[PDB]
Structure 1
């Protein structure tokens, strides 16, 4: 039931994420909008992704103090329900737009000459709206229940309880299995298909093929290295609470790792612009033509 001193790692990783994402996710948003202007349906997804990790980034300050102040912030018994829900519900939105891009890259490279209706800007808007709606609806149970819970150990939390409630375990399991592995499996399969289709192009020079390979592998590996520790610890917590709830002895030995990994989950906000709208020579031109405007 106790805790530790997490005022060093996620007092600083969040600051770095803010300071590197605010001036880069905005430029990724600009590049995505430029893509949308010239009838490129990928940009829509890209654009949404930027939104998905801008309104997330602006949520961090309310939390950095939560981790600078030793594990408590009294800023609103009704405020850790619409700013803090966002904190826990963009990791599962961004990843979805990570998947939507991958399929859109599978359907255009692996299956050209087909599926022209699915690569319109209109259908991109429809899919993006459905993604937003379903992600904001499935993760909507924390809005209902009371969240700001105070212990006697001098710290009160925002959206986490120690030991956690029964309903939290089932949503944690759902998050792990239907917000991380399913979109990640789709990304892996789609980039596998793209590599398998591009290994037959007559018009690629045995070098761009290697560049595509080491870009797709990185795209499917950064998501893993950023989200895996958190969901591994989340599944571990939700499997120990559902075998022995009263004997909350596992929690004390894993609280620090849990919070450090939750902080580490925030590196996708700086990985996404770099890997998606700033690494290639095309969007980088539309960015360098905007830093001078």
Structure 2
């Protein structure tokens, strides 16, 4: 007989995961409701960034709205009572949010990269129209790519007579599902992650190289390392700290001590982007994608009595990493502030 391992459902699933979802739900609702208000009604002129970020706030918000049912499902010992159609919807909206977020973060990273590494030369490519078209596509690519989940997922009856809402699919269709899940993880997670780390290295590199500008607090004259002050014997490409003390402002004659660092908004936002997005990937996206795959494998290839112990640890970890996937929806809001365009700047 086709031996099936015995599985173990912990208190994390029935009691403690739904509690976390309640917190995500509340904070997520607040964070993104406010964010959406700030974009739609206070940011225009939107740069391409605000276009992308608005799309994130939009997808996180709609996702959060699916939490109550998920919360109810775990409180109800994972017995799903809203039927097949709503199960498929729950899972569909989860993965659309998941992969939409990933791609939008890629666009945001790409956007910021071009603006940082090619400041004078990308202007046309970074305009808002392009951002809107890219955003439409991103939704098209995701909906198309994730649509099979409407087939694969859905409702099923357990031996104990309670109803399961598959997040993946039932045994009869697992093989093809595995192949499908491999494609999306490769195309809509692995590739992006590579593109993102690409951008990020280049961005950091350009930021560490770019010499700081300084400004005369007495007459406003900006010193640009790129131009230097050739007419007074400072060559193009000299750093302000390398200028001998005896130099003075060439416009009014005050000393170096009267100068101050020019605050470069784009450098700060780029670093806040890197830090936040790498954190999010390490806590929410990577562990989930590792564990989704291992857990499918376990279900297919590692189904023997020797493995079962290891297997329900995998299943157990999978549950936590699936819960950790939801944290982007109440962390992304800090992105919109710290890494997005500044309110007015005028």
Q: Report TM bin, short chain.
A: 0.7 to 0.9
Give the 3-state SS of the residue equivalent to 1:196 in structure 2. helix
Q: Which residue of 2 aligns with 1:217?
A: 275
Alignment deviations for residues 168-219 of structure 1 (CA, whole Å, 9 cap, x no partner): 2122222332222222222221121111111122226599768854652332
Give the 3-state SS of the residue equivalent to 2:211 in structure 1. coil
Alignment deviations for residues 89-133 of structure 1 (CA, whole Å, 9 cap, x no partner): 311111111111000000111111222332111111110010001
Q: Quick check: 1:4–1:255 contact (8 Å CA) kept in 2?
A: no
Is 2:87 aligned against 1:80? yes
1:240 CA displacement: 3.4
Change (3 A) 1:280 1:107: closer
Match of 2:64 among 57, 62, 67: 57
Structure ID, larger Rg: 2
Alignment deviations for residues 124-144 of structure 1 (CA, whole Å, 9 cap, x no partner): 111001000111111111212
Q: Which residue of 1 aligns with 2:96?
A: 89
1:73 CA displacement: 1.1
* Cα distance in 2, alignment partners of residues 12 and 35 from structure 1: 34
Q: Which residue of 2 aligns with 1:290?
A: none
Q: Which residue of 2 aligns with 1:2?
A: 7
Structure 2 unaligned blocks of 5 or more: 1-5, 214-260
Residue range with higher mean Cα deviation, 111-120 or 14-23 = 111-120
* Cα distance in 2, alignment partners of residues 94 and 109 from structure 1: 22
Is 2:338 aligned against 1:279? yes
Structure 1 unaligned blocks of 5 or more: 287-293
Change (3 A) 1:145 1:73: same
Q: Which residue of 1 aligns with 2:187?
A: 178
Q: Which residue of 2 aligns with 1:289?
A: none
Q: Quick check: 1:31–1:277 contact (8 Å CA) kept in 2?
A: no
1:261 CA displacement: 1.4
Q: Quick check: 2:157–2:164 contact (8 Å CA) kept in 1?
A: yes
Change (3 A) 1:214 1:23: closer
Alignment deviations for residues 64-94 of structure 1 (CA, whole Å, 9 cap, x no partner): 1111111111212222122331123311111
Match of 2:53 among 46, 63, 79: 46
Give the aligned CA root-mean-square deviation in angstroms: 2.8
* Cα distance in 2, alignment partners of residues 39 and 233 from structure 1: 38
* Cα distance in 1, alignment partners of residues 58 and 126 from structure 2: 21
Question: Highest relative contact order (Cα 8 Å, sep 6+), 1 or 2?
Answer: 1
Change (3 A) 1:155 1:251: farther
Match of 1:98 among 105, 108, 115: 105
* Cα distance in 1, alignment partners of residues 7 and 299 from structure 2: 16
Q: Quick check: 2:269–2:340 contact (8 Å CA) kept in 1?
A: no
Match of 1:194 among 199, 203, 206: 203
Give the TM-score, by structure 1 length.
Answer: 0.85
Give the 3-state SS of the residue equivalent to 2:338 in structure 1. coil
* Cα distance in 2, alignment partners of residues 215 and 146 from structure 1: 34
Give the TM-score, by structure 2 length.
Answer: 0.73
Q: Which residue of 2 aligns with 1:266?
A: 326
1:14 CA displacement: 0.8
